[PDB]
Design a protein around this nucleic acid. Structure first.
Ligand code: ZN
Lengths: 23, 214, 97, 63, 127, 49
RNA sequence: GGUGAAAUUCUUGGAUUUAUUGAAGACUAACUACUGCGAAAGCAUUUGCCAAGGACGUUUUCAUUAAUCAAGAACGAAAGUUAGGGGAUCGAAGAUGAUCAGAUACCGUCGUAGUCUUAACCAUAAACUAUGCCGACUAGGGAUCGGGUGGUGUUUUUUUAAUGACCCACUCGGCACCUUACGAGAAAUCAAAGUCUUUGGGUUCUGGGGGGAGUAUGGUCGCAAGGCUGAAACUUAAAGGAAUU
């Protein structure tokens, strides 16, 4: 819920979506 | 199972020869038995001595003169100037808020090959009849003060065979020479040398060491 | 809301003050913000000095003091130092002890 | 077996979590002029003698 | 008239050293410490253990010959507390009240001119 | 390892592999030393060499 | 040693402590301030060099050359990325001791990467005074810098001092401010947040209930991490600001 760890969670699942999409 | 204080001889610590008290204290050494002479262990022993105790007066209480045991001549253990320093809580009492500290440091030589680093501290005095609550000096005034101090500390050197410097540090005369050489710029209270180091020494010269007796 | 006209701080005319470590917490805090207080004390406590002097050499016993500026962070200070969190009235009173 | 008898000259509130200990100032009957601060347990009036098994160590409050 | 030494009272938190040395500091006369005298720690830099240490080193100092002692009270220094421990004010006075002569009291806490990074962290000890 | 076992102490096998330790003794005879002679250690270190 | 208490930890092959040195890499304590400079970020040892910059003074000069600014640019903490040095201290990760019901956290001891440095990137921060800039008017004290007067003040000696500096009083110009208050604001409050239903000095940027969401998508830049721009479907009657009990 902390607007930092919220942001980090979004920024992690974005990076893991980049690595999924590079395939 | 030893208690080696049985085999520990006391030796005669003399402080030649400019200071009034030519006798300071007694340092114990492991007894000079097989293959290890006392000299080897008692050479280079830096004994700090408070200049209050070394000259009796309480006006010399904010000063420590390091003395290294250097010579022996038929069991005669005499020291020589190794360094002067201020007391850790007079230095700190002179530092105060609403002032300006000035630190001059010069890596000078002497007449003899003694590479001495002389420091010096000088604080700004709020002059009598002042309603302004601080005595802050300008950067230009401090640059000008450091210059004045630096060339005085170097003028009182090339003379000053470290012996003559010792005999001119004790009577507070560099302090009251810099006072009048800076008063033309800023009041400047508490001018002291504060510290002297021996960064490097010449070759021994036991004549130069022993001329400090009799 | 904004609690202080300052910021529990001084920084006005400056961009960034070089920080200072809290004496007990070790927490780094900007110098201007850090609660500074000079701890000036006699080397020997105010109970021992009788037996100190009577058993000391050198009569007149100079008795040198000790000086060290304690820098405290805000939380370490709130532990019953001179802070005693005061009313929104008495917050503004700058006058020391 | 040296135990030192010392009369109290003034009592100074009470230390401890509770008021179980009373901080007191004593004067040593033997070799007097020596004033030392000390802790007691039981009720203390003035002029009362305490028996110290150590004359040396001083006293602090029991936070 | 009196043979001298150096007291070197290193009173930190967590322990007190009453390490009496020679004038020069080359030779150790006695190095009794606070934790030596109580084997149930909880309290190593305490006034009581410091007094006990001071009494032992002083008694030894009387046996070995030295009569008076200069005192060099010392905190941790470095980047830590830099304030003398609670056993510093015990170790001194206890040196005197044992019967040793004391003098030239001066604090030699090694203060850093422009320090390194202190132990802990940005937020420091959290508790 | 890519040779036949005649040619080298690493040869042969139905896979290319050394099969035994490549760290050979200092006292290994002139003819036996292939791999890492008197290897005080092996592998890639962390931080500084 | 280190602790609220301890344990990991090293120690008699003398650890910790003491002293004489030496090395290495960071760091500029105290002075240090309701003080300074800078476009912001930032910048506190010393000396020298190189350029710059405001302020003041000015009976110098040019004479509207200006204000703010899509696009377009330069600088831009920390962390982070390349590759070389460097690696002392401290310390993401990790090892490990405690606590715990569990605690791969808070506390303890170690500890890679980590930058401190050279070159090249990145371009975001509660990057904050959460207050765009240029301009005018409305009402006590210090203090920084420059200048003007005054003191028969101190120091000044080389004869009286030519002075000069420091200091004192009055005075302005600009500065970082602060203390009391008729106007303003939902109030907290304030030198501008005043001159605002008695509404217009110039000008740039931004917002239109809360979420979804700074998310998807498409371009753009970047070695990567990411940065810039940036939606909708659907959902909901509140969410929020300030003060009071
Ligand atoms: Zn703190």
């Amino acid at each position: 819920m902390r607007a930092k760890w919220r942001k980090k969670r979004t920024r992690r699942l974005k990076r893991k979506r980049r690595k999924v999409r590079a395939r | 199972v030893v208690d080696p204080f049985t085999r520990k001889e006391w030796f005669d610590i003399k402080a030649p020869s400019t200071f009034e008290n030519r006798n300071v204290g007694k340092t114990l050494v492991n007894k000079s038995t097989g293959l290890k002479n006392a000299s080897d262990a008692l050479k280079g022993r830096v004994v700090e001595v408070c200049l209050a105790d070394l000259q009796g007066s309480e006006d010399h209480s904010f000063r420590k003169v390091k003395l290294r045991v250097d010579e022996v001549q038929g069991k005669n253990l005499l020291t020589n100037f190794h360094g002067m320093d201020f007391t850790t809580d007079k230095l700190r009492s002179m530092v105060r808020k609403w002032q300006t500290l000035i630190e001059a440091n010069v890596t000078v030589k002497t007449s003899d090959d003694y590479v001495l680093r002389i420091f010096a501290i000088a604080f700004t005095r709020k002059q009598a009849n002042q309603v302004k609550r601080h005595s802050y000096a300008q950067s230009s005034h401090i640059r000008a003060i450091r210059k004045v101090i630096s060339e005085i500390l170097t003028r009182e050197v090339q003379n000053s065979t470290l012996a003559q410097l010792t005999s001119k540090l004790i009577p507070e005369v560099i302090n009251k020479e810099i006072e009048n050489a800076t008063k033309d710029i800023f009041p400047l209270q508490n001018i002291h040398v504060r510290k002297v180091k021996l960064l490097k020494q010449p070759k021994f010269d036991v004549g130069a060491l022993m001329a400090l007796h009799g | 809301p904004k609690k202080r006209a300052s910021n529990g701080r001084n920084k006005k005319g400056r961009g960034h003050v070089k920080p200072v470590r809290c004496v007990n917490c070790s927490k780094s805090i900007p110098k201007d913000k850090a609660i500074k207080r000079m701890a000036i004390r006699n080397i020997v406590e105010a109970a021992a000095v009788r037996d100190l002097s009577e058993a000391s050499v050198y009569p007149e016993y100079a008795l040198p003091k000790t000086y060290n500026k304690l820098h405290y962070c805000v939380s370490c200070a709130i532990h019953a130092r001179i802070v005693r969190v005061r009313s929104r009235e008495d917050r503004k009173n700058r006058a020391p002890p | 077996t040296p135990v030192t008898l010392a009369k109290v000259i003034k009592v100074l509130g009470r230390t401890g979590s509770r008021g179980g200990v009373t901080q007191v100032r004593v004067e040593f009957l033997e070799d007097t002029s020596r004033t030392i601060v000390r802790n007691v347990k039981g009720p203390v009036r003035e002029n009362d003698i305490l028996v110290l098994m150590e004359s040396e160590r001083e006293a602090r409050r029991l936070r | 008239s009196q043979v001298f030494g150096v007291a070197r009272i290193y009173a930190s938190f967590n322990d007190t050293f009453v390490h009496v040395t020679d004038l020069s500091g080359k030779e150790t006369i006695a190095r009794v410490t606070g934790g030596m005298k109580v084997k149930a720690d909880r309290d190593e830099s305490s006034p009581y253990a410091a007094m006990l240490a001071a009494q032992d080193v002083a008694a030894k100092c009387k046996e070995v010959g030295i009569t008076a002692v200069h005192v060099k009270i010392r905190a941790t220094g470095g980047t830590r507390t830099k304030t003398p421990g609670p056993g510093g004010q015990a170790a001194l006075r206890a040196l005197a009240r044992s019967g040793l002569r004391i003098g030239r009291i001066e604090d030699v806490t090694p203060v850093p001119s422009d320090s390194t990074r202190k132990k802990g962290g940005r937020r420091g000890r959290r508790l | 390892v890519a040779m036949n076992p005649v040619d080298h102490p690493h040869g042969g096998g139905n896979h290319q592999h050394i099969g035994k330790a490549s760290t050979i003794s200092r006292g290994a005879v002139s003819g036996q030393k292939a791999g890492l002679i008197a290897a005080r250690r092996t592998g890639l270190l962390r931080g500084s060499q």
